[PDB]
C-alpha cells in the first residue's frame, strides 16, 4: 500500500506514498481499467476548505499554529454565514501553483512553482475580462521569451453568475466547412468558428484566421472581442533543409493558453481561469498539423518530398512527420520563440518525477498522456511506470458553455 | 450495466457488455490507476468452479449449452477432480482454450488472427529431449520457409508445482548477450543473464554479436538441459536499406520467427507452464525496440553518424530521423526475402477492424492502450485516438516468475 514504480530503462525504483492523500476517483475499478478514457452546499464545503488550509499551513511549516487555527475558525465562520468564502491572495497563489503541480496529464510540470498568478477576482464585465486577458497574453508572450501565467476570474456563486471564456484556447485558428466537401482552416474549431459568426463575427475566411474572444461575465450573454494582432505572436513555418517548405504557407501561434478548464481550490470553483505556458514541438507538428481530424498535411508534405506513397510500409507518413516536426522547432528557435522538443521535455519530466518522489513522496502521472505522440519509446518516459491518482487543488474539465448557458 | 468507448478521430462509439464476464482483477482501484505498471499452488477447492465456468463457455460456443453432452462432461470432470485433484481437457477443449487465451490477450495488437492458431498437443511429452523434438517441429511448421503460420505447443499441465515443464528461454529464438570486463555489452544486452546461465550449464559460446542461444528445457520438474536448434531451422534476415548502401555494412541481421516461450497458459483452472507460441513480427518490435532501445543494440548513434545528421542538440530530431530509416530497413529486408512482417500502420488498422467486430459479435474487446499503441509515430495510427477498456478474461496468458529463481536443483 506504499506503492513502487520501476523505470525499466534504468531499473530505478521510486516508492510512492503521496497517493494515499488522494481524494477524488479515477474511474477505474478492480475489474476494469479506464486509463485510456478521455473524460470520466454548506456541508460539503467546510471539510474541503479545512483540507486545503491544512495542507497550506503545512507547506509554510505553520501546521497547528495560532495563525492556522485562527484562519480555520475564520473560514469556518464565513462559510456558516455566507455559504462560501474568499481565498487570501497567498492561498490563491498556492492553490493555483498546486493545481498545475497536481495535473497528472501535464509533462511540463517541472516548472510548476514559477507560475505567475493574476488575480482578476475584482472583474465584473466582459470588457474587463478582455482587458485582463490582453494583459495576460502580453505578459506571457514577452516578445517570445514566454512566461507561464494564469489569470483567475471570480469564482462560481450559484451557477447562474458563472464567468466563462467560451474559447477552448485564447488563441486559435478558425475553421470553415466547405460547400464542396471538407474543411478550410482548423476542423477542430468548426463549431466554435460557427458560433462566433452565428453570434456576430465577420470571418475573413482564410486558413489561419485568429478567432475572436467570446467572453461571459457574471452569466450574461457572451461578447466578441478581437485580440490586438500585435499581441498574437506567430511563427512562419519553414524547414532548415527544404526550401519548398515555406511554399506550404504554414504558420502557428507562439502562445498555448488553455481557457476552458475549471480550477478547484479548497472547494471553490473558478470557471474562468485561462492559463498558458510554452509549446512542446509535437503538439503543433504531430497533432495540429498531422491529425486526420485537423490540418492533415501529411499527404502534401510526402508528395513534395517525392516519397513512395503507394504502400504504408515505406513509412512515408513517418518520414514526413519527422521533417514537419524538425521544421516547427527550427522555425520557433529561429524566431527566438520559446519551444521545447519532446526529448528535452520528457527528460525534464523524469527529473521532475525524481524531485517529487524525493521532496514530496509521489507524483501523479498519466502515461497515456505523458508519452509524446511520436517516437514514444526513444523517450525516457516510455519506460517509466507511473501511478495515476487525483489530488486537489486541480484543473477539471467542464461542459461547453453553449450547451448550458440560459441564453 | 453497459459501457461506451469513443474513437475521437471518427466519433465511432461502441458499447461493451463483455466486461461483465470479467473475473480476475486489474490492479487498479477507484483511487489509483496502475495502467502503466508492467507486471503487477492450486487446490481442489476452487478448481471445479473454474472448470465449470470454462466448460460453460465451451459448450455455449458450440451451441450445446445445457445439452446432455454438456452435463455429462461437467459430471465427468467433477468426479475426476474429487478423485484425482485435477482433470484432463479433451482435445477440442484445449484448442478452444488456447485460441481464446490469445483472443483475450488485451496487450496484443495482432489478435485479428486469433481464430487461425495451429495448436500442437504435447501433453504426452515426458523428457527434455522430447521437448526439444516438439519445439523443433513447431519452429519448422511455423517458419514455413518464410510464409509464417501462428502456432502454439502445449506441454503437460502443472500438477503439484514440483514437476513443472518450463522453457527457460524467454523466446525460442534469441541472440546471446555478453558482458565484457570493460563494461560494454556484445550482442543483445537484454539476454545477458540468460546467456550466463547457459554458459554455466555448459554452453560453448561463440561470443559473436548474433549468436542464436541454445534451448534450455525443463521436463517434469527435473534440472534443465541444453539443446542447439538446428541452424537450418533458424530463418534469419540480413538488414539492408533500400536507399542507403552503407546500411548493410553495419552487419545487422534478425531472426524471422517471434516465439514467446516463458508465459503461463490458464484454461479452466489448469496451468500450462510451458506453452511456447509464435506469430510474425510487427516491424517496430525489431527496428524500434530491439535495435534502438538504449538498453538493447542501441544503433541510433552509428546510424545517425553514417547519415551525417546534426547530432549535437536533440532538437534536430536526429534520433527520430535515424529511427525511421532503421524501421524502413527492417521492413524492406523482410519483404525482400519474402519473410512475413507487418508494418505498424497495417497492424493497427487491422486491430481497429478486429476490435469493432469483437464489440459487435462478442460485446467487447479488452485492450491495453499502453501496449497497443506502437512505439513510434503513435498518433498517426488509428489506435491512438481509440478509447479502450482493459479487463481480464479467461482463458488467459499470464506472466510467471523466471524458473531459475524458483527451481529446486537436483544436481
Ligand atoms: C510551460 C510549459 C508546458 C508544457 C510544455 C506543457 C505540456 C503539456 C502537454 C504536452 C499536455 C498534453 C495535453 C495535450 O497533448 O493536449 C499538457 C496537459 C496539461 N497541462 Fe501542461 N504544459 C505546460 C504548461 C502548463 C501550465 C502553465 C499549466 C497550468 C497552470 C498546465 C496545465 C495542464 C493541464 C491541466 C493539462 C491536462 C489537461 C487534461 O486533463 O486533459 N500546463 N501539458
Ligand atoms: C500473428 C502476429 C502477431 C503479432 C503481429 C503480435 C504482436 C504483438 C505485440 C506488438 C505485442 C506487444 C508486446 C511487445 O511489444 O513486446 C504483443 C503482445 C502479446 N501477444 Fe501478440 N502478436 C502476434 C501473435 C500472437 C500469438 C500467436 C499469440 C498467442 C498465441 C500472441 C499473444 C500475445 C500476448 C499474450 C501478448 C501480451 C504480452 C504481455 O502481457 O506482456 N500474439 N503481440
Ligand atoms: C498551457 C499549455 C501548455 C502547453 N504546452 N500545451 C497546452 C495545450 C494542452 C492542453 C492542456 C489542457 F489543460 C487542456 C487541453 C484540451 C485538450 C483537447 C480537448 C479535447 F478534450 C481533446 N484535446 C485535443 C489541452 C497548454
Ligand atoms: C507471438 C508474438 C508475435 C509478435 N509479433 N511478437 C511477439 C513478441 C511480443 C511479446 C508477446 C508476448 F506474448 C509476450 C512477450 C513478453 C514481453 C517481453 C518482456 C519485456 F517487456 C520485453 N518483451 C520482449 C512479448 C510475440
Ligand atoms: C512503463 C511501461 O508500462 C512499459 O515501458 C511498457 C509500456 N508499453 C509497452 N508497449 C509495448 N508494446 N511493449 C512494451 O515493452 C511496453 N513497455
Ligand atoms: C483515446 C485516447 O485516450 C486519446 O486519443 C488520447 C490518448 N493520449 C493523448 N495524449 C495527449 N498528450 N493528448 C491527447 O489528446 C491524447 N489523446
Ligand atoms: Zn486503471
From Swiss-Prot, chain A:
Q: How is it modified after translation?
A: Ubiquitinated; mediated by STUB1/CHIP in the presence of Hsp70 and Hsp40 (in vitro).
**Residues binding L-arginine:** 169, 278-279, 283
Q: GO molecular function, one example?
A: ATPase binding
What is this protein's function? Produces nitric oxide (NO) which is a messenger molecule with diverse functions throughout the body. In the brain and peripheral nervous system, NO displays many properties of a neurotransmitter. Inhibitory transmitter for non-adrenergic and non-cholinergic nerves in the colorectum. Probably has nitrosylase activity and mediates cysteine S-nitrosylation of cytoplasmic target proteins such SRR. Inhibitory transmitter for non-adrenergic and non-cholinergic nerves in the colorectum.
Q: What positions does the entry give for heme b binding?
A: 106, 397
Q: Where in the cell is it found?
A: Cell membrane, Sarcolemma; Cell projection, Dendritic spine
Q: Report the outcome of residue 279 to F.
A: No decrease in nitric-oxide synthase activity
Domains: entry comment: The PDZ domain participates in protein-protein interaction, and is responsible for targeting nNos to synaptic membranes. Mediates interaction with VAC14.
Name the family the entry cites: Belongs to the NOS family.
First and last residues shown, out of full length: 299 to 716 of 1429
What keywords does the record list, in alphabetical order? Calmodulin-binding, Cell membrane, Cell projection, FAD, Flavoprotein, FMN, Heme, Iron, Membrane, Metal-binding, NADP, Oxidoreductase, Phosphoprotein, Synapse, Ubl conjugation
- What is its quaternary makeup? Homodimer. Interacts with DLG4 (via N-terminal tandem pair of PDZ domains); the interaction possibly being prevented by the association between NOS1 and CAPON. Forms a ternary complex with CAPON and RASD1. Forms a ternary complex with CAPON and SYN1. Interacts with ZDHHC23. Interacts with NOSIP; which may impair its synaptic location. Interacts with HTR4. Interacts with SLC6A4. Interacts with VAC14.
Expression by tissue: Isoform N-NOS-1 is expressed in brain and colorectum. Found in the Auerbach's plexus of the enteric nervous system. Isoform PNNOS is expressed in the penis, urethra, prostate, and skeletal muscle, and coexists with the cerebellar nnos in the pelvic plexus, bladder and liver, and is detectable in the cerebellum.
Q: Could you identify this protein by its name?
A: Nitric oxide synthase 1
Relate the outcome reported for changing residue 279 to S: 30% decrease of nitric-oxide synthase activity
Gene Ontology terms: cellular component: azurophil granule; calyx of Held; caveola; cell periphery; cytoplasm; cytoskeleton; cytosol; dendrite
**Has the keyword Ubl conjugation been applied to this entry?**
yes
Organism equals Rattus norvegicus (Rat)
The entry marks the following residues as binding (6R)-L-erythro-5,6,7,8-tetrahydrobiopterin, namely: 36, 368-369, 382
> Per the UniProt entry, what is one GO biological process?
arginine catabolic process
> Corresponding gene?
Nos1
Amino acid at each position: 500500500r506504499f506503492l513502487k514504480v520501476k523505470n525499466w530503462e534504468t531499473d530505478v525504483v521510486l516508492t510512492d506514498t503521496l497517493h494515499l492523500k488522494s481524494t477524488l476517483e479515477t474511474g477505474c475499478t478492480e475489474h476494469i481499467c479506464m486509463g485510456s478514457i478521455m473524460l470520466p452546499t454548506k456541508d460539503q464545503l467546510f471539510p474541503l476548505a479545512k483540507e486545503f488550509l491544512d495542507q497550506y499551513y503545512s507547506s509554510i511549516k505553520r501546521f497547528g499554529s495560532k495563525a492556522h487555527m485562527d484562519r480555520l475558525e475564520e473560514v469556518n465562520k464565513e462559510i456558516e454565514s455566507t455559504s462560501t468564502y474568499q481565498l487570501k491572495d497567498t492561498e490563491l497563489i498556492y492553490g493555483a501553483k498546486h493545481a498545475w503541480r497536481n495535473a497528472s496529464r501535464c509533462v511540463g510540470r517541472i516548472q510548476w512553482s514559477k507560475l505567475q498568478v493574476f488575480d482578476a477576482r475584482d472583474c465584473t464585465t466582459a470588457h474587463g475580462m478582455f482587458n485582463y486577458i490582453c494583459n495576460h497574453v502580453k505578459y506571457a508572450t514577452n516578445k517570445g521569451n514566454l512566461r507561464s501565467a494564469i489569470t483567475i476570474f471570480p469564482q462560481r456563486t450559484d451557477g447562474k453568475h458563472d464567468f466563462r471564456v467560451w474559447n477552448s484556447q485564447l488563441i486559435r485558428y478558425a475553421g470553415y466547412k466547405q460547400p464542396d466537401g471538407s474543411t478550410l482552416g482548423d476542423p477542430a474549431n468548426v463549431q466554435f468558428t460557427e458560433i462566433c459568426i452565428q453570434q456576430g463575427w465577420k470571418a475573413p475566411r482564410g486558413r489561419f484566421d485568429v478567432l475572436p474572444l467570446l467572453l461571459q461575465a457574471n452569466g450574461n450573454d457572451p461578447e466578441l472581442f478581437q485580440i490586438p494582432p500585435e499581441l498574437v505572436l506567430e511563427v512562419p513555418i519553414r524547414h532548415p533543409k527544404f526550401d519548398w517548405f515555406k511554399d506550404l504557407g504554414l504558420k502557428w501561434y507562439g502562445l498555448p493558453a488553455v481557457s476552458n478548464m475549471l480550477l478547484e481550490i479548497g472547494g471553490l470553483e473558478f470557471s474562468a481561469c485561462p492559463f498558458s505556458g510554452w509549446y512542446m514541438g509535437t503538439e503543433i507538428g504531430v497533432r495540429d498539423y498531422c491529425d486526420n481530424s485537423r490540418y492533415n498535411i501529411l499527404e502534401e508534405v510526402a508528395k513534395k518530398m517525392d516519397l513512395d506513397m503507394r504502400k504504408t510500409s515505406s513509412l512515408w507518413k513517418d518520414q514526413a512527420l519527422v521533417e514537419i516536426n524538425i521544421a516547427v522547432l527550427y522555425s520557433f528557435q529561429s524566431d527566438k520563440v520559446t519551444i521545447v522538443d519532446h526529448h528535452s521535455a520528457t527528460e525534464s519530466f523524469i527529473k521532475h518525477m525524481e524531485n517529487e518522489y524525493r521532496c514530496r513522496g509521489g507524483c501523479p502521472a498519466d502515461w497515456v498522456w505523458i508519452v509524446p505522440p511520436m517516437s514514444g519509446s526513444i523517450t525516457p518516459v516510455f519506460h517509466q511506470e507511473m501511478l495515476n491518482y487525483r489530488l486537489t487543488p486541480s484543473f477539471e474539465y467542464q461542459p461547453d458553455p453553449w450547451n448550458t448557458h440560459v441564453w
